[PDB]
C-alpha cells in the first residue's frame, strides 16, 4: 500500500540491555549496513536525522 | 452430522425416546380416550428445527 520502501533501523537502548528497531521511509541512497546518526550534533549526510 | 455436540446428541436422544408407539394396555384404562401416539414424527416428513 506504500510506494516508498521502509527502512528497518536498529538502535541501542541507552538505559537498558536491549536493541530498539525503528521503521521509517528510506531516503534514496540508503543501504543495508549503513550507519544513520540521529540528533542535534549529527553531520550533513544522506539518511541522517537532524534538526532543520 | 457425524461430528456433533453432546447437548445436540442429548436432545436427539430424547426425541428418539419420545418417538414411540403408545402402549396397548393404556387403551384399557378407565376413561381413556387416546387411541394412538398422536405426536409420532417421521425423520423424512417432519424435521426437528434444531
Amino acid at each position: 500500500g506504500r510506494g516508498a520502501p521502509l527502512a528497518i533501523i536498529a538502535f541501542r537502548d541507552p538505559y537498558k540491555y536491549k536493541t530498539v528497531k525503528t521503521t521509517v521511509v528510506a531516503a534514496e541512497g540508503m543501504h543495508t549496513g549503513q550507519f544513520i546518526h540521529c540528533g542535534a550534533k549529527a553531520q550533513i549526510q544522506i539518511g541522517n536525522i537532524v534538526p532543520v | 452430522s457425524a461430528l456433533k455436540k453432546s447437548f445436540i446428541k442429548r436432545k436427539l436422544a430424547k426425541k428418539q425416546k419420545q418417538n414411540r408407539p403408545m402402549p396397548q394396555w393404556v387403551r384399557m384404562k378407565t376413561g381413556n380416550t387416546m387411541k394412538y401416539n398422536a405426536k409420532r414424527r417421521h425423520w423424512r416428513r417432519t424435521k426437528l428445527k434444531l
Binding site: - | 447437548f7 445436540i8 436432545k11 428445527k49 434444531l50
Partner: protein, 88 residues
C-alpha cells in the same frame, strides 16, 4: 436464480438453541437470543407482543417455588415446629 435453485444452498444455520429459553433462536454471529434476549441480564418482552407475553409469562411453566410459598403462607410460614406427637 431466486427460488428452487437458490434454496439448495441453504445449509448453514443462522440460529441455534438458547441456554436460557431452549428455543432455536440464538443468533450465532450476534451471540444473542432473538426471543428472550440472552445473554442480556433482563428479559425480552414487548407490549405489542401480547401473545408472546402470554406464551412466555409466569404460570405457563411449573411455578414450583411460587406454589410452595403459597402453600406455606396458608399457615403463617411456621418453622421449627412439628405436628403434635401422636400415633395411629
Amino acid at each position: 436464480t431466486k427460488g428452487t435453485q437458490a434454496f439448495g444452498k441453504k445449509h448453514v444455520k443462522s440460529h441455534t438453541l438458547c441456554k436460557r429459553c431452549g428455543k432455536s433462536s440464538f443468533h450465532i454471529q450476534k451471540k444473542r437470543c432473538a426471543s428472550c434476549g440472552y445473554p442480556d441480564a433482563k428479559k425480552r418482552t414487548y407490549n405489542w407482543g401480547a401473545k408472546s407475553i402470554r406464551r412466555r409469562t409466569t404460570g405457563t411453566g411449573r411455578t414450583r417455588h411460587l406454589r410452595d410459598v403459597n402453600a406455606r403462607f396458608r399457615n403463617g410460614f411456621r418453622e421449627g415446629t412439628t405436628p403434635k406427637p401422636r400415633a395411629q
